[PDB]
Design an enzyme around this catalytic site. Structure first.
Site, PDB file in Angstrom:
ATOM      1  N   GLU A  23     107.271  79.929 -24.764  1.00 15.89           N
ATOM      2  CA  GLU A  23     106.508  79.956 -26.003  1.00 15.89           C
ATOM      3  C   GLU A  23     105.374  80.938 -25.759  1.00 15.89           C
ATOM      4  OE1 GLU A  23     103.684  80.164 -28.065  1.00 15.89           O
ATOM      5  OE2 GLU A  23     103.038  78.100 -27.716  1.00 15.89           O
ATOM      6  N   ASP A  39     100.735  70.029 -31.672  1.00 11.13           N
ATOM      7  CA  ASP A  39     101.268  70.774 -32.807  1.00 11.13           C
ATOM      8  C   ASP A  39     102.720  70.342 -32.991  1.00 11.13           C
ATOM      9  OD1 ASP A  39     102.371  72.641 -34.609  1.00 11.13           O
ATOM     10  OD2 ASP A  39     101.047  74.242 -33.907  1.00 11.13           O
ATOM     11  N   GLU A  67      97.590  88.182 -27.113  1.00 10.87           N
ATOM     12  CA  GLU A  67      97.696  87.680 -25.729  1.00 10.87           C
ATOM     13  C   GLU A  67      98.708  88.465 -24.881  1.00 10.87           C
ATOM     14  OE1 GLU A  67      98.040  83.346 -25.328  1.00 10.87           O
ATOM     15  OE2 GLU A  67      97.467  83.223 -27.459  1.00 10.87           O
ATOM     16  N   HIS A  76      99.071  75.635 -35.387  1.00 16.17           N
ATOM     17  CA  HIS A  76      97.824  76.031 -34.737  1.00 16.17           C
ATOM     18  C   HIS A  76      97.631  77.550 -34.768  1.00 16.17           C
ATOM     19  CE1 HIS A  76     100.636  76.704 -31.380  1.00 16.17           C
ATOM     20  NE2 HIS A  76      99.704  77.478 -30.852  1.00 16.17           N
TER      21      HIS A  76
HETATM   22  N1  LIG Z   1     102.628  86.162 -16.796  1.00 17.95           N
HETATM   23  C1  LIG Z   1     102.598  84.825 -16.788  1.00 17.95           C
HETATM   24  N2  LIG Z   1     103.170  84.169 -15.755  1.00 17.95           N
HETATM   25  C2  LIG Z   1     103.138  82.832 -15.745  1.00 17.95           C
HETATM   26  N3  LIG Z   1     102.604  81.999 -16.642  1.00 17.95           N
HETATM   27  C3  LIG Z   1     102.043  82.679 -17.652  1.00 17.95           C
HETATM   28  C4  LIG Z   1     101.999  84.056 -17.797  1.00 17.95           C
HETATM   29  N4  LIG Z   1     101.345  84.399 -18.972  1.00 17.95           N
HETATM   30  C5  LIG Z   1     101.017  83.245 -19.497  1.00 17.95           C
HETATM   31  N5  LIG Z   1     101.409  82.161 -18.752  1.00 17.95           N
HETATM   32  C6  LIG Z   1     101.248  80.754 -19.099  1.00 17.95           C
HETATM   33  O1  LIG Z   1     102.075  80.496 -20.209  1.00 17.95           O
HETATM   34  C7  LIG Z   1     101.529  79.406 -20.972  1.00 17.95           C
HETATM   35  C8  LIG Z   1     101.589  79.799 -22.436  1.00 17.95           C
HETATM   36  S1  LIG Z   1     101.136  78.385 -23.475  1.00 17.95           S
HETATM   37  C9  LIG Z   1     102.713  77.504 -23.658  1.00 17.95           C
HETATM   38  C10 LIG Z   1     102.640  76.341 -22.677  1.00 17.95           C
HETATM   39  C11 LIG Z   1     103.934  75.528 -22.593  1.00 17.95           C
HETATM   40  N6  LIG Z   1     105.080  76.411 -22.242  1.00 17.95           N
HETATM   41  C12 LIG Z   1     104.226  74.822 -23.922  1.00 17.95           C
HETATM   42  O2  LIG Z   1     105.225  75.219 -24.560  1.00 17.95           O
HETATM   43  O3  LIG Z   1     103.447  73.911 -24.277  1.00 17.95           O
HETATM   44  C13 LIG Z   1     100.104  79.170 -20.460  1.00 17.95           C
HETATM   45  O4  LIG Z   1     100.011  77.927 -19.774  1.00 17.95           O
HETATM   46  C14 LIG Z   1      99.837  80.359 -19.527  1.00 17.95           C
HETATM   47  O5  LIG Z   1      99.056  79.957 -18.404  1.00 17.95           O
END
Ligand SMILES: Nc1ncnc2c1ncn2[C@@H]1O[C@H](CSCC[C@H]([NH3+])C(=O)O)[C@@H](O)[C@H]1O
Ligand SMILES: COCn1cc(CN(CC[C@@H](N)C(=O)O)C[C@H]2O[C@@H](n3cnc4c(N)ncnc43)[C@H](O)[C@@H]2O)c(N)nc1=O
Ligand SMILES: COCn1cc(CN(CC[C@@H](N)C(=O)O)C[C@H]2O[C@@H](n3cnc4c(N)ncnc43)[C@H](O)[C@@H]2O)c(N)nc1=O
Ligand SMILES: Nc1ncnc2c1ncn2[C@@H]1O[C@H](CSCC[C@H]([NH3+])C(=O)O)[C@@H](O)[C@H]1O
Lengths: 343, 341, 343, 343
Positions: free
Chosen positions: C123, C31, C132, C280
């Site tokens: 993010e 994206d 979520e 997305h």
């Molecule tokens: N409480 C939490 N602690 C740690 N990781 C988390 C938690 N909640 C969601 N996540 C992770 O946060 C991510 C959100 S998606 C964003 C992924 C990455 N930061 C990017 O910008 O491409 C996912 O990989 C989840 O597994």
């Protein structure tokens, strides 16, 4: 614990029965006319197998199969369903004035108690590649309620596998994995994960249909007899194969489909998901090799397709294949729980 | 000599053997755009040849010297190092031009001319303009040029532009993935996959293409043959800054070249651009091992570094980046072993 | 932990398996608007990162942390709860940044950081911004933020606007009327038609649309991540008063969101509005069960109430009325199960 | 060394640079007939390899040594003169056969092997069997062969046969007549037309053809690699007397070759005949300067004399006559510079 719980991760069961709790999904299955019509045909044309008989419907959903059994003259039908759809089935039983013949029993077939033994078990427990969802085990488990002389609808299941060639599909997945090949995605080197990415994409069985002209050998058949098999038989399914190659080229993997037979007293009715037959919502399934095998016509392609049941209501698939004349071997791991719906 | 010092014997042997074949000469002669454009540049600038002393560097069959003779040149020295020189002499005799065309067997870096010339003619352009390193011979020959004398061609423009062509990319990647298979007749080849990718992607792709695959207007690099010195072509550094007109994957850089005959009557251009009729030079494309994603409006920056080698060709270094994201690519190519597609 | 108490085990498992796939990370990474805008927001505010301590909440592949490193961060703690954390670790090593990025596997609510951070990056946005419930993790992480600290993104704007889309509305009855037939293979299905309608309307619709279907200027609801607490997102009440710009039938409310990175050098916006290039997240539409007629100049007033549930999503309650006529409508939606309509 | 004494340095440089490319090795490896037949010949004669010392002359990628290893060889010395030697070394390591395969970089005429071998394997065949002069290296390597030792391949057959192809013959003049015009851009080119014809006719034509153009059973010339010396290949005199099966104009001679692997268990043949599936060697045709008319039942007799030169190739001298009529034709060809005609 119940047999279901002991073999099923809770997260998977919650998700699984939530999926089937939706009316839209029931509509989707019902609008598969080949399926629905073939079931109705198998039941009605074998009406004597139902006339004044006790019936068990394993995983009845909306209840359509129990209604077919009712149409065939069954005097009492126990319709077991673990999702919330059970309430919707009850609604239809009342509004169709069949309260005296169809009895909805909410719960898992491994946990409910039925009031009596039944003459015949009906169900539609087939998933992708026949075995996905592990519902065949529930189906077999339900035989604890089957009279000695009892019958199963469907009675047997045939899995067909055959080698195929399809460069476009192969390249389509390889292209997805090569994203992780980039040394500078926004300045970030991702390439160290390309191996892991290829593994992940090629772990996905491909669900969709195809032209039979991609098939390079007549299929090999593996048969499960539902009247005879026990639950434990499906924890580890070993399918050996020896293909006599009809065409020369690259084998990009193995194609899978399945037939079931309703072996009734009056006639045997087949429900087929083969690519030579009209498309169903099961489509067909293809397992790709990470590296295709080259084979000449007349060669022999041998090996094993191994299915190991896991706690996520699915199977770990290991396919090992070899071209006997050259020793070219391929080994591949697939996760049947997570397919790629390409159609 | 300057030639032998910069050239491996093996390469020179293969090189002059190649041009010793009449069929190859036929090949160059039947490129009508080339031959016709040369004849046009010479005849329409007939005053630049009229009663003049001419030097033809690498005359081959002698066709350019005949054009110079048609335009009224008083005396033409046609220097040719391959055995083709013998055939050129036969044609000089059968065309009754013995008094105007003088064939000199040998390399232009080694032969002796009786006098200085008013104009130098030659066709020293290779793939990407610079392949074969004959431009250096051409520049070397200026030791025989009178002070204000002229060069035909006078200047050369190399054009660079980014392209998208996943079909080409995957076509090469497919070839390299042969070395990916873990069980070829039972043998694991995968340890050589990297080396295979490097080899295949070192190959410039020679062929033509639809202009719509170009994602930005070309950047131009100009060599002035009147001013350039031989040594200037040993290390060629071409900086570039493309303004992307289209979004997508940049699979590499496309190269082509124009030459101009800047004569007294008119300027005549010979072009090998993909927008023009096809020549035997086609066009040249250098692939990235991994394409770069760019949005329209982005700038693609970097350097194309050409290093002359002893095999009469160039080692190509392309470094490119999308400025807005830092997405970078580095690539090394061997202009010596191209893929004729 | 705070996470476990607010999340059912079943939902959390499915949730972190989803993000454990490289293809999903890849989907988010590809994206361009999302990823490019984050990089742009970070690099152009380099003074907020140069030699600073950074926390990346839910780093996934680690991409945002690498952006923080490109901006000159001294130390980045990249926290990730799914199995993706290891792939992130691999990328940190292969990009020679082990002395600046520390991948911490686990939930941000459960792990411990060795020190306080100057800025938090993340993010955490889902459909309608709040889906979520990861924004709560993002806010929870402020226990590690210095009193001086900053949040990237800093604020989030949810926009609501009334729309007309007769085709989308009618589509629901077209799909549900499958059940309104007295003899589907001999079965009267009609008694379930109402339930099928209810089911379809409980689904928020995910896709994009022409802005001309919007009938009033949007109303905005803002979360300041610097000031908000976790508990503030458990019950979200969005009152609205729309002043109709066009006459017609209002079929429901459209949602989209913006976030802003308010740095020391400049403010950078990431918008998922229907006037901007598609992301997305697309846009989300919640239908009214009964459309409302409004003339241009009329006022449409009411409330959108979002109630957090343990399935990492929200129960959506919308009540709206045309003040000039008193004609009223409702709807209850389940944001966890949206309908992806986009094609 | 013997190699340098018979080879011009420029040619050697060109030669090993050619085989230093992975793409060329791949070109040979993807010839399924070639590679498969080598593997088949080695594996089906496993007793000729089990616990034996093997010499692989010009191992290239090492593919034949791995076959020797598959067959149970105790130790294999793989000699390779180009830079491919390093790549073979890599594969030996990555296939865990360092204890069985020893790669020796260098020319077989120059390196030192520590012990005598039981069998030599190699694929030294060029166009017309003899092109590239590598068979001499193969024979030279017998200084390392135990008495009673074996050679794979064991014999080589070159086949010659007269052909008719009016199209191919006329083509030479169609191309040379380019020069027969008095004003090509104002230039009279005709004086070079004879020379152009000569040049085209000196080129053996490499490509395939329909066997129906063959006018007599082939004449065979056999080299027994177990019995021959390298010096036997410096001057190869192939007399021929063809018994014409068809009446017509003979435009020249067609060439192809077979090799045979005479093992203890069986003899395996590798054929490049025009009656067999195409290989990367194709076939070779040498034209007469003037075609000869022959009636079916006539005899066409003469000589094909192959003279080795320092360019790792041969000057081909063909003299032929129709015995019943005395009609004579000849041609002198340069095998180093063939014309690749195949499309
Ligand atoms: N409480 C939490 N602690 C740690 N990781 C988390 C938690 N909640 C969601 N996540 C992770 O946060 C991510 C959100 S998606 C964003 C992924 C990455 N930061 C990017 O910008 O491409 C996912 O990989 C989840 O597994
Ligand atoms: C989606 O594609 C089609 N499809 C369909 C099915 C079968 N279907 C539905 C059939 C049923 N609704 C009808 O109408 O016959 C399964 C139905 O059976 C229920 N179920 C599963 N395991 C259970 C258990 N241990 N105890 C009680 N109920 C159980 C489940 O809740 C569903 O309602 C499948 N196995 N694979 C597929 O791919
Ligand atoms: C792939 O495409 C073909 N191609 C063709 C040419 C042109 N041809 C012939 C030119 C002329 N005969 C005409 O007819 O135009 C070059 C001729 O120049 C000769 N030559 C080269 N370096 C020399 C040296 N130091 N001293 C003396 N002679 C030298 C060489 O032996 C050839 O006969 C080119 N420059 N680039 C190309 O790529
Ligand atoms: N005198 C020589 N000594 C060593 N290697 C040689 C010699 N002459 C040719 N070669 C190599 O022999 C190989 C012939 S190609 C056959 C390659 C491989 N054995 C296969 O079966 O695929 C090339 O790699 C040449 O470099």
């Amino acid at each position: 614990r119940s047999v279901f719980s002991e073999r099923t991760e809770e997260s998977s069961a919650v998700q699984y029965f939530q999926f089937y709790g939706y009316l839209s999904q029931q509509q989707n299955m019902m609008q598969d006319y080949v399926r629905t019509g073939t079931y109705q045909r198998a039941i009605l044309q074998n009406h004597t197998d139902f006339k004044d008989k006790i019936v068990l419907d394993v995983g009845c959903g909306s209840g359509i199969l129990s209604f077919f059994a009712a149409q065939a003259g069954a005097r009492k039908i126990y319709a077991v369903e673990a999702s919330t759809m059970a309430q919707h089935a009850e609604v239809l039983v009342k509004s169709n004035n069949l309260t005296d013949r169809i009895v909805v029993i909410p719960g898992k077939v491994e946990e409910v108690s039925l009031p009596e033994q039944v003459d015949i078990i009906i169900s539609e427990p087939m998933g992708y590649m026949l075995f996905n969802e592990r519902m065949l085990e529930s189906y077999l488990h339900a035989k604890k309620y089957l009279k000695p002389s009892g019958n199963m609808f469907p009675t047997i299941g045939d899995v067909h596998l055959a080698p195929f060639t399809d460069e476009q599909l192969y390249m389509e997945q390889f292209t997805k994995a090569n994203f992780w090949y980039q040394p500078s995605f926004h300045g970030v080197d991702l390439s160290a994960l390309r191996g892991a990415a290829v593994d992940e994409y090629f772990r996905q069985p491909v669900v969709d249909t195809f032209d039979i002209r991609i098939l390079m050998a007549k299929s090999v058949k593996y048969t499960v007899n539902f009247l005879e098999a026990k639950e434990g038989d499906l924890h580890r399914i070993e399918i050996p194969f020896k293909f006599h190659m009809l065409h020369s080229g690259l084998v990009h993997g193995l194609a899978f489909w399945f037939d079931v037979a309703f072996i009734g007293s009056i006639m045997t009715v087949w429900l087929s998901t083969a690519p030579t037959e009209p498309l169903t919502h099961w489509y067909q399934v293809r397992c790709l090799f990470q590296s295709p095998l080259f084979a000449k016509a007349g060669d022999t392609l041998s090996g094993t397709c191994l299915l190991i049941a896991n706690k996520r209501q699915s199977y770990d698939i290991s396919i090992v294949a070899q071209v006997d004349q050259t020793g070219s071997k391929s080994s591949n791991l697939l996760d049947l729980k997570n397919p790629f719906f390409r159609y």
